[PDB]
Amino acid sequence: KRQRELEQQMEAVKRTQQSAQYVEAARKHYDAAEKLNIPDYQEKEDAFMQLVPPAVGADIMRLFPEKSAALMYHLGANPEKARQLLAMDGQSALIELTRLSERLTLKPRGKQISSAPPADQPITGDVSAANKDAIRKQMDAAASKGDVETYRKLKAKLKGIR
Amino acid sequence: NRLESILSRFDADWTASDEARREAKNDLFFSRVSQWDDWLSQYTTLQYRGQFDVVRPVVRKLVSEMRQNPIDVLYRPKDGARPDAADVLMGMYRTDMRHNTAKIAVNIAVREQIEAGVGAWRLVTDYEDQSPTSNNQVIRREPIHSACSHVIWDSNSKLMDKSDARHCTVIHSMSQNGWEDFAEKYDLDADDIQIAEFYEVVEKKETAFIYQDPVTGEPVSYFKRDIKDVIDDLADSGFIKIAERQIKRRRVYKSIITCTAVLKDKQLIAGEHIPIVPVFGEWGFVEDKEVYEGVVRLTKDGQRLRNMIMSFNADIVARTPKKKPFFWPEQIAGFEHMYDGNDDYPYYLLNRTPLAYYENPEVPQANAYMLEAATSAVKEVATLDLETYVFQDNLATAMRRDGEIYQSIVNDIYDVPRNVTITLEDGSEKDVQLMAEVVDLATGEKQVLNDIRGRYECYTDVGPSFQSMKQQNRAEILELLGKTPQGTPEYQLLLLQYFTLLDGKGVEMMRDYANKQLIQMGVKKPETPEEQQWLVEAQQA
Amino acid sequence: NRLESILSRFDADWTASDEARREAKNDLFFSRVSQWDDWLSQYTTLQYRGQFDVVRPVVRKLVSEMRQNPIDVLYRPKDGARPDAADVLMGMYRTDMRHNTAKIAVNIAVREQIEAGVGAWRLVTDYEDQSPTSNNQVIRREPIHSACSHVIWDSNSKLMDKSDARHCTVIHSMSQNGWEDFAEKYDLDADDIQIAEFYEVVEKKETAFIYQDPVTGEPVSYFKRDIKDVIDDLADSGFIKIAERQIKRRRVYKSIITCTAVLKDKQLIAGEHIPIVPVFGEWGFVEDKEVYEGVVRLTKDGQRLRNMIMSFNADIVARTPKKKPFFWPEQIAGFEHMYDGNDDYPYYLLNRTPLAYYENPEVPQANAYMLEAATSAVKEVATLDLETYVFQDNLATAMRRDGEIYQSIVNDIYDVPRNVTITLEDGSEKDVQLMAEVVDLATGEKQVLNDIRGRYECYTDVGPSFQSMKQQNRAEILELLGKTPQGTPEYQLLLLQYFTLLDGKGVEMMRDYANKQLIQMGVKKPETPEEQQWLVEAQQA
């Protein structure tokens, strides 16, 4: 809803360049927040810009729009460290803010190939001894029907396998 | 050289399966031709022979049992593909199940499974909308009568689906015209009648020698030659060797072979998996032999007992009740015209020289006992569960395997933009066009429609049928209304749902009114604009 | 030197388990080939060989009873592990149970358990989503058909789970060409065919010489050489010796040997436990030997008795009812065309020199009580409890060991960040990354989310099924509504709970409306932003 009211504010202003750049920076802010989808942050950023001068928040928008969400979450969630960063000078405050934004890191896609692939091998049987017994039983069946030629060929096949 | 290797493999599988083969031939001859075998024919003495079977009612009630519990196959969306493509694939699967030939194949195969154990229909594909312009193909299933006689599975495979098999043969004893048309619908008609279709799966197995680097490790060293091509690259890389994943590529091939002469077709392009899918009874290995069982042998022994006792009783009946006497030829030397049976004389005349008779056979009166002894055998050795679980769960396995084979065929076929009708759940048919993308709205970037082109897992969920679940829901909500105070909105909401769950042609207008109202107080979401206008005109009131 | 040691151990185990193997295979041959043992065909007088068994209905009832008793395996998060990782691990176990291969393996194991006593299926893992880019793998379970002879457990082990067993072999057969191709797939070929897959569990047994200081005791002097290295330190430490905690490191190893020739594979690593998990019937030790039972021994005796008495019946019936006379050849010296059976004359002739006949065997009618007594015994001694408690509790122990090996192997494989779908309770599928290294925004730590790798112990709770719990909850709550005054908020709360607890596609509209309502007055917490908006919109109203 806060994004919607800021959209209403941009439309009211449009109906200035600094406010524009600030509001697209805030739109990338909201895109990053929606990627995060942290609900308690929604109060965190606005309480932050209540605590800090609007110029500081605007510079945070400009220098890094999407990293702004993370840093304002850190500072609102920890208002004490936000107060100490406010007290200490602005340029080194930007240094600390950039260091904290880099502290969270991003896109760590080093390697995802494998981890000790074990001996994942299957097993197989062709039932050859069962095939010997099978030849024996076709021999038995051919004996019954008097199929002499098949009987003798089966006998030869049986005697050939050891 | 290929012919003799194929023949050797076929002969090996033939010998390996020959026991179950002869046994199933015996079973089918029992259950389809005559209940009496030669074994009893030599070991018997009665003369007037009659078989009054009672197995066929049993198999009818069984097949009814398999009919009353429909089995549905689902498609797991894998590779992160959208669930809707899987939904569409299930739609094609259902619209291919609703076709008449689908029931024909299913019923024939299941009936043969109940009697023999294996019915094993085969998938087929063909051209539709016969015209040179199009090349779209559909996928059907062809049942195999006496499949145990004309389906030869690979002996090495040890699977329910026999999908472990790399090959399988299908013999075809063809007449002269049979050979002619059988060949011509596929190949040349020159004749060398036992013809066969040796199906076969080729596969490509390698090592692929995956490598890793400071950057993410792309596939390196796909083959053995590749290592000899990267001798410096294997050593200079940040990571030398991590894994040796044996990726495999497999392809099925169909060959038309003949017993005497050379094969008529070498290999043929047809899908990815074997169109043949088997169905099994309670099947396993017992000292390493393929054994599958049905309901023919046990009920068969019972039937043999019952038929032999009834034929024995009939042999008892098949005789004249009149007594046959014993006397000398000189004892009736004067009286031969009387003892003929064609006349009735007052008194029996005998010369000077009180006689014996021939003892006609009599019922033991014990035959009753054994009669139902048999009866009981045949009518509850088979059954009694609510279903013979092994039969339908083997059927479910066959369904799912048919699912993967059908999915593979569809993936191998459906690329060209096509329009197909989807049979949704509740049998709601619907026409869904497959692809040709149509320019995107958000980006104008093709975005091929549906694109069932992918890789999904097929899985069945046997249980409550749609009709069964809807009837249960109707009964449940009826009980709810029976135990619900009136006036509360829940009462009327359940009323409307109940009218929604009813039948068609009868209560269609009340159901439509219920749907309209359900949408109008907002419980039911609108799917078509008329319902949206109804919602807005209701809410403004 | 290794091969003959392996062979000696295998032969010792084979000799130890020979009696169990032969009795189990005898029971299978009875149940699966012919119920008539060789002694029966020896000790018999019959001519009709019919097989009227009743074992199959009883086996069907038992297997149905086990099927209707689902078993879940749970993983205790040990060493202070998060409950979420354990929950995901049960989701993994669920999503590997519902696969058709696992269920089929379970069915085969249990049916051959109720038959012989042992099913002892086989785990397996393999590369999944075949591509050299990745190396991710899944784990499957395949059954061991006739495992009583193809699986040889360690003789020295004395567990139900055989975790004491450090070795077990798998028996296969090869043809010649089968031998060369099996070698080619794995190893080199030495021409000769029975194979053995002798597995190994080796362990490092040490004492670690745990040493303490004024500070908390860290592990010091892990080895005996270490003590020799700290001879000055042990006299320098505040405490010289307190305990000898025997820390151990064990690994399962895989080897392929053959009977005559040398082993094919020396050493291979796959997991840390033996994947083979066995199932047993009434198992125990009878005078210091492993014994496992089934429902086939006494029932086999009774079935043999029934079959032989019914064969008596059939053989008694199986002859001509006509009576065979005995007489001198001269008694009918002229009249031979009378006594043929080919014609029926009004009377029959006898010369000067009232005749004898052949005694026909007759049914005692005393057979009855034998038949029905044997029938009742074979139906009753087998089953009837609500379940054969030994069988399902043994199955529960088997599930526990199977899940143990599952946790071991999954810990052994799933170290790579992978994306796996979770089958939660009620089969709810959902796809989640393995660790999901995404960094905290409130803390800033990497905090891989699940990181399933750890050490969890298995514990199974057989009992109220989730569908069973749902149905009984529905019954209870509908009774409550029947005995509850209306109007009270608890009445409507129970109503909404019931509609939520109902089935899916049937009543999804009432269930969704009920969840909406329950979130709106705040009984249940909102879960998706529409629910929170609904709750706040109701609250402001």
mmCIF file of all heavy atoms in Angstrom, chain B residues 3-30:
data_model
loop_
_atom_site.group_PDB
_atom_site.id
_atom_site.type_symbol
_atom_site.label_atom_id
_atom_site.label_comp_id
_atom_site.label_asym_id
_atom_site.label_seq_id
_atom_site.Cartn_x
_atom_site.Cartn_y
_atom_site.Cartn_z
ATOM 1 N N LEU B 3 21.641 -60.911 -38.161
ATOM 2 C CA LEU B 3 20.518 -61.842 -38.115
ATOM 3 C C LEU B 3 20.749 -62.953 -37.102
ATOM 4 O O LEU B 3 19.864 -63.259 -36.296
ATOM 5 C CB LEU B 3 20.272 -62.437 -39.499
ATOM 6 C CG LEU B 3 19.102 -63.420 -39.579
ATOM 7 C CD1 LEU B 3 17.776 -62.708 -39.344
ATOM 8 C CD2 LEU B 3 19.097 -64.162 -40.909
ATOM 9 N N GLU B 4 21.934 -63.568 -37.120
ATOM 10 C CA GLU B 4 22.172 -64.688 -36.220
ATOM 11 C C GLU B 4 22.292 -64.235 -34.771
ATOM 12 O O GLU B 4 21.867 -64.960 -33.868
ATOM 13 C CB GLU B 4 23.415 -65.468 -36.650
ATOM 14 C CG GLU B 4 24.711 -64.688 -36.618
ATOM 15 C CD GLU B 4 25.058 -64.095 -37.967
ATOM 16 O OE1 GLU B 4 24.130 -63.796 -38.748
ATOM 17 O OE2 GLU B 4 26.264 -63.948 -38.250
ATOM 18 N N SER B 5 22.858 -63.053 -34.524
ATOM 19 C CA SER B 5 22.895 -62.536 -33.160
ATOM 20 C C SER B 5 21.488 -62.277 -32.634
ATOM 21 O O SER B 5 21.166 -62.637 -31.493
ATOM 22 C CB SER B 5 23.729 -61.257 -33.108
ATOM 23 O OG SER B 5 23.412 -60.405 -34.195
ATOM 24 N N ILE B 6 20.640 -61.661 -33.459
ATOM 25 C CA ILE B 6 19.256 -61.421 -33.064
ATOM 26 C C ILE B 6 18.546 -62.741 -32.799
ATOM 27 O O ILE B 6 17.805 -62.883 -31.819
ATOM 28 C CB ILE B 6 18.528 -60.602 -34.146
ATOM 29 C CG1 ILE B 6 19.176 -59.224 -34.301
ATOM 30 C CG2 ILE B 6 17.051 -60.479 -33.821
ATOM 31 C CD1 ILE B 6 18.413 -58.289 -35.209
ATOM 32 N N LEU B 7 18.762 -63.725 -33.675
ATOM 33 C CA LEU B 7 18.137 -65.029 -33.498
ATOM 34 C C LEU B 7 18.618 -65.711 -32.228
ATOM 35 O O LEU B 7 17.822 -66.347 -31.533
ATOM 36 C CB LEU B 7 18.419 -65.913 -34.712
ATOM 37 C CG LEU B 7 17.584 -65.612 -35.957
ATOM 38 C CD1 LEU B 7 17.719 -66.730 -36.977
ATOM 39 C CD2 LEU B 7 16.125 -65.394 -35.586
ATOM 40 N N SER B 8 19.907 -65.593 -31.910
ATOM 41 C CA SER B 8 20.433 -66.187 -30.687
ATOM 42 C C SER B 8 19.814 -65.540 -29.456
ATOM 43 O O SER B 8 19.435 -66.229 -28.503
ATOM 44 C CB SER B 8 21.954 -66.053 -30.656
ATOM 45 O OG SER B 8 22.481 -66.555 -29.442
ATOM 46 N N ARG B 9 19.710 -64.211 -29.457
ATOM 47 C CA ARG B 9 19.090 -63.525 -28.326
ATOM 48 C C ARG B 9 17.624 -63.918 -28.179
ATOM 49 O O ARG B 9 17.145 -64.185 -27.066
ATOM 50 C CB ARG B 9 19.238 -62.015 -28.496
ATOM 51 C CG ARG B 9 20.683 -61.569 -28.596
ATOM 52 C CD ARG B 9 20.837 -60.096 -28.293
ATOM 53 N NE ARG B 9 20.253 -59.272 -29.344
ATOM 54 C CZ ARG B 9 20.833 -59.029 -30.512
ATOM 55 N NH1 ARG B 9 22.009 -59.547 -30.821
ATOM 56 N NH2 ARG B 9 20.214 -58.248 -31.391
ATOM 57 N N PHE B 10 16.899 -63.972 -29.300
ATOM 58 C CA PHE B 10 15.504 -64.388 -29.266
ATOM 59 C C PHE B 10 15.366 -65.813 -28.754
ATOM 60 O O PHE B 10 14.466 -66.108 -27.965
ATOM 61 C CB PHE B 10 14.877 -64.261 -30.653
ATOM 62 C CG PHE B 10 13.664 -65.130 -30.848
ATOM 63 C CD1 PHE B 10 12.466 -64.820 -30.231
ATOM 64 C CD2 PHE B 10 13.728 -66.259 -31.649
ATOM 65 C CE1 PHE B 10 11.349 -65.620 -30.407
ATOM 66 C CE2 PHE B 10 12.618 -67.064 -31.828
ATOM 67 C CZ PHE B 10 11.427 -66.743 -31.208
ATOM 68 N N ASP B 11 16.248 -66.710 -29.196
ATOM 69 C CA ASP B 11 16.196 -68.095 -28.751
ATOM 70 C C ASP B 11 16.496 -68.205 -27.263
ATOM 71 O O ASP B 11 15.873 -69.004 -26.556
ATOM 72 C CB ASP B 11 17.180 -68.937 -29.562
ATOM 73 C CG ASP B 11 16.635 -69.317 -30.925
ATOM 74 O OD1 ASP B 11 15.620 -68.725 -31.348
ATOM 75 O OD2 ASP B 11 17.224 -70.204 -31.579
ATOM 76 N N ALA B 12 17.451 -67.416 -26.771
ATOM 77 C CA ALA B 12 17.767 -67.435 -25.348
ATOM 78 C C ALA B 12 16.570 -66.987 -24.520
ATOM 79 O O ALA B 12 16.205 -67.634 -23.531
ATOM 80 C CB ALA B 12 18.981 -66.551 -25.069
ATOM 81 N N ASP B 13 15.937 -65.879 -24.918
ATOM 82 C CA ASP B 13 14.747 -65.424 -24.202
ATOM 83 C C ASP B 13 13.619 -66.443 -24.313
ATOM 84 O O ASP B 13 12.882 -66.680 -23.347
ATOM 85 C CB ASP B 13 14.299 -64.065 -24.737
ATOM 86 C CG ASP B 13 15.328 -62.978 -24.499
ATOM 87 O OD1 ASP B 13 16.124 -63.107 -23.547
ATOM 88 O OD2 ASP B 13 15.337 -61.992 -25.267
ATOM 89 N N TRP B 14 13.470 -67.045 -25.493
ATOM 90 C CA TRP B 14 12.471 -68.078 -25.726
ATOM 91 C C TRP B 14 12.638 -69.227 -24.744
ATOM 92 O O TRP B 14 11.691 -69.625 -24.058
ATOM 93 C CB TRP B 14 12.611 -68.556 -27.174
ATOM 94 C CG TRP B 14 11.684 -69.634 -27.607
ATOM 95 C CD1 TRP B 14 11.911 -70.977 -27.558
ATOM 96 C CD2 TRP B 14 10.397 -69.466 -28.209
ATOM 97 N NE1 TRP B 14 10.832 -71.658 -28.066
ATOM 98 C CE2 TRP B 14 9.889 -70.754 -28.475
ATOM 99 C CE3 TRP B 14 9.616 -68.354 -28.536
ATOM 100 C CZ2 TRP B 14 8.640 -70.959 -29.053
ATOM 101 C CZ3 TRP B 14 8.376 -68.560 -29.109
ATOM 102 C CH2 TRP B 14 7.900 -69.852 -29.361
ATOM 103 N N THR B 15 13.856 -69.757 -24.651
ATOM 104 C CA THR B 15 14.134 -70.845 -23.723
ATOM 105 C C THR B 15 13.929 -70.417 -22.280
ATOM 106 O O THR B 15 13.381 -71.186 -21.481
ATOM 107 C CB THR B 15 15.563 -71.344 -23.915
ATOM 108 O OG1 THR B 15 16.477 -70.257 -23.726
ATOM 109 C CG2 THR B 15 15.739 -71.917 -25.309
ATOM 110 N N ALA B 16 14.356 -69.204 -21.927
ATOM 111 C CA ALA B 16 14.213 -68.746 -20.552
ATOM 112 C C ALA B 16 12.753 -68.639 -20.144
ATOM 113 O O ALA B 16 12.401 -68.983 -19.010
ATOM 114 C CB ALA B 16 14.916 -67.402 -20.372
ATOM 115 N N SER B 17 11.892 -68.169 -21.041
ATOM 116 C CA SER B 17 10.485 -67.959 -20.728
ATOM 117 C C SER B 17 9.600 -69.144 -21.093
ATOM 118 O O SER B 17 8.391 -69.086 -20.852
ATOM 119 C CB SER B 17 9.976 -66.707 -21.446
ATOM 120 O OG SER B 17 9.940 -66.914 -22.849
ATOM 121 N N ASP B 18 10.172 -70.210 -21.656
ATOM 122 C CA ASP B 18 9.370 -71.254 -22.279
ATOM 123 C C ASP B 18 8.455 -71.947 -21.271
ATOM 124 O O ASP B 18 7.373 -72.423 -21.623
ATOM 125 C CB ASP B 18 10.308 -72.251 -22.965
ATOM 126 C CG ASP B 18 9.577 -73.252 -23.842
ATOM 127 O OD1 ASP B 18 8.332 -73.219 -23.917
ATOM 128 O OD2 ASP B 18 10.262 -74.083 -24.472
ATOM 129 N N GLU B 19 8.873 -72.027 -20.008
ATOM 130 C CA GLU B 19 8.043 -72.708 -19.017
ATOM 131 C C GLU B 19 6.734 -71.959 -18.803
ATOM 132 O O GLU B 19 5.648 -72.538 -18.929
ATOM 133 C CB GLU B 19 8.807 -72.883 -17.698
ATOM 134 C CG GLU B 19 9.175 -71.600 -16.957
ATOM 135 C CD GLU B 19 10.399 -70.917 -17.531
ATOM 136 O OE1 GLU B 19 10.768 -71.216 -18.685
ATOM 137 O OE2 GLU B 19 10.985 -70.069 -16.826
ATOM 138 N N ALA B 20 6.833 -70.663 -18.519
ATOM 139 C CA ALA B 20 5.658 -69.829 -18.341
ATOM 140 C C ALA B 20 4.895 -69.803 -19.650
ATOM 141 O O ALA B 20 3.667 -69.711 -19.656
ATOM 142 C CB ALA B 20 6.047 -68.418 -17.898
ATOM 143 N N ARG B 21 5.619 -69.904 -20.765
ATOM 144 C CA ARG B 21 4.957 -69.885 -22.062
ATOM 145 C C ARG B 21 4.038 -71.088 -22.235
ATOM 146 O O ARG B 21 2.848 -70.918 -22.521
ATOM 147 C CB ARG B 21 6.002 -69.813 -23.176
ATOM 148 C CG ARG B 21 5.414 -69.788 -24.573
ATOM 149 C CD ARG B 21 6.394 -69.244 -25.602
ATOM 150 N NE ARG B 21 7.615 -70.031 -25.708
ATOM 151 C CZ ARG B 21 8.789 -69.660 -25.217
ATOM 152 N NH1 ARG B 21 8.937 -68.525 -24.555
ATOM 153 N NH2 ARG B 21 9.843 -70.449 -25.393
ATOM 154 N N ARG B 22 4.551 -72.304 -22.026
ATOM 155 C CA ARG B 22 3.719 -73.484 -22.234
ATOM 156 C C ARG B 22 2.595 -73.454 -21.214
ATOM 157 O O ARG B 22 1.456 -73.838 -21.507
ATOM 158 C CB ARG B 22 4.455 -74.818 -22.070
ATOM 159 C CG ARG B 22 5.188 -75.030 -20.755
ATOM 160 C CD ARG B 22 6.252 -76.108 -20.856
ATOM 161 N NE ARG B 22 7.440 -75.781 -21.629
ATOM 162 C CZ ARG B 22 8.631 -75.614 -21.077
ATOM 163 N NH1 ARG B 22 8.802 -75.725 -19.771
ATOM 164 N NH2 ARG B 22 9.680 -75.368 -21.851
ATOM 165 N N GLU B 23 2.927 -73.022 -19.997
ATOM 166 C CA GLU B 23 1.961 -73.024 -18.910
ATOM 167 C C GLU B 23 0.799 -72.087 -19.227
ATOM 168 O O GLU B 23 -0.373 -72.426 -19.018
ATOM 169 C CB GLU B 23 2.696 -72.634 -17.628
ATOM 170 C CG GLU B 23 1.945 -72.791 -16.340
ATOM 171 C CD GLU B 23 1.062 -71.616 -16.044
ATOM 172 O OE1 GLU B 23 1.386 -70.494 -16.485
ATOM 173 O OE2 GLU B 23 0.060 -71.814 -15.343
ATOM 174 N N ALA B 24 1.110 -70.922 -19.796
ATOM 175 C CA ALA B 24 0.076 -69.970 -20.177
ATOM 176 C C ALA B 24 -0.718 -70.454 -21.382
ATOM 177 O O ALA B 24 -1.914 -70.170 -21.495
ATOM 178 C CB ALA B 24 0.706 -68.608 -20.460
ATOM 179 N N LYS B 25 -0.068 -71.162 -22.313
ATOM 180 C CA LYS B 25 -0.828 -71.772 -23.401
ATOM 181 C C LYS B 25 -1.838 -72.763 -22.852
ATOM 182 O O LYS B 25 -2.998 -72.791 -23.281
ATOM 183 C CB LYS B 25 0.092 -72.476 -24.396
ATOM 184 C CG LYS B 25 1.260 -71.660 -24.859
ATOM 185 C CD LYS B 25 0.821 -70.320 -25.392
ATOM 186 C CE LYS B 25 1.983 -69.361 -25.377
ATOM 187 N NZ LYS B 25 2.320 -68.951 -23.985
ATOM 188 N N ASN B 26 -1.404 -73.588 -21.901
ATOM 189 C CA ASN B 26 -2.316 -74.506 -21.237
ATOM 190 C C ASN B 26 -3.461 -73.743 -20.591
ATOM 191 O O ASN B 26 -4.627 -74.129 -20.714
ATOM 192 C CB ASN B 26 -1.554 -75.313 -20.190
ATOM 193 C CG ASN B 26 -0.682 -76.385 -20.805
ATOM 194 O OD1 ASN B 26 -0.848 -76.744 -21.970
ATOM 195 N ND2 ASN B 26 0.267 -76.894 -20.027
ATOM 196 N N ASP B 27 -3.139 -72.636 -19.927
ATOM 197 C CA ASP B 27 -4.152 -71.859 -19.224
ATOM 198 C C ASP B 27 -5.178 -71.278 -20.186
ATOM 199 O O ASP B 27 -6.383 -71.324 -19.921
ATOM 200 C CB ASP B 27 -3.483 -70.741 -18.442
ATOM 201 C CG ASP B 27 -2.547 -71.265 -17.397
ATOM 202 O OD1 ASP B 27 -2.673 -72.458 -17.045
ATOM 203 O OD2 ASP B 27 -1.682 -70.497 -16.934
ATOM 204 N N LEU B 28 -4.716 -70.716 -21.302
ATOM 205 C CA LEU B 28 -5.630 -70.075 -22.241
ATOM 206 C C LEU B 28 -6.473 -71.110 -22.971
ATOM 207 O O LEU B 28 -7.671 -70.906 -23.194
ATOM 208 C CB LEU B 28 -4.848 -69.193 -23.217
ATOM 209 C CG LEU B 28 -3.789 -69.775 -24.159
ATOM 210 C CD1 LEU B 28 -4.390 -70.328 -25.449
ATOM 211 C CD2 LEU B 28 -2.721 -68.734 -24.466
ATOM 212 N N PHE B 29 -5.865 -72.239 -23.347
ATOM 213 C CA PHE B 29 -6.646 -73.331 -23.911
ATOM 214 C C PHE B 29 -7.701 -73.804 -22.927
ATOM 215 O O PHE B 29 -8.823 -74.139 -23.325
ATOM 216 C CB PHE B 29 -5.729 -74.490 -24.295
ATOM 217 C CG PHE B 29 -6.450 -75.644 -24.919
ATOM 218 C CD1 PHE B 29 -6.886 -75.581 -26.230
ATOM 219 C CD2 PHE B 29 -6.707 -76.791 -24.187
ATOM 220 C CE1 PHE B 29 -7.552 -76.643 -26.803
ATOM 221 C CE2 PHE B 29 -7.374 -77.855 -24.756
ATOM 222 C CZ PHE B 29 -7.799 -77.782 -26.065
ATOM 223 N N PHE B 30 -7.354 -73.835 -21.643
ATOM 224 C CA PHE B 30 -8.330 -74.141 -20.611
ATOM 225 C C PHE B 30 -9.471 -73.135 -20.594
ATOM 226 O O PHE B 30 -10.642 -73.524 -20.643
ATOM 227 C CB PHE B 30 -7.635 -74.170 -19.254
ATOM 228 C CG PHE B 30 -8.571 -74.333 -18.110
ATOM 229 C CD1 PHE B 30 -9.170 -75.548 -17.867
ATOM 230 C CD2 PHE B 30 -8.884 -73.260 -17.294
ATOM 231 C CE1 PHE B 30 -10.038 -75.702 -16.821
ATOM 232 C CE2 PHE B 30 -9.760 -73.409 -16.243
ATOM 233 C CZ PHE B 30 -10.342 -74.632 -16.009
#
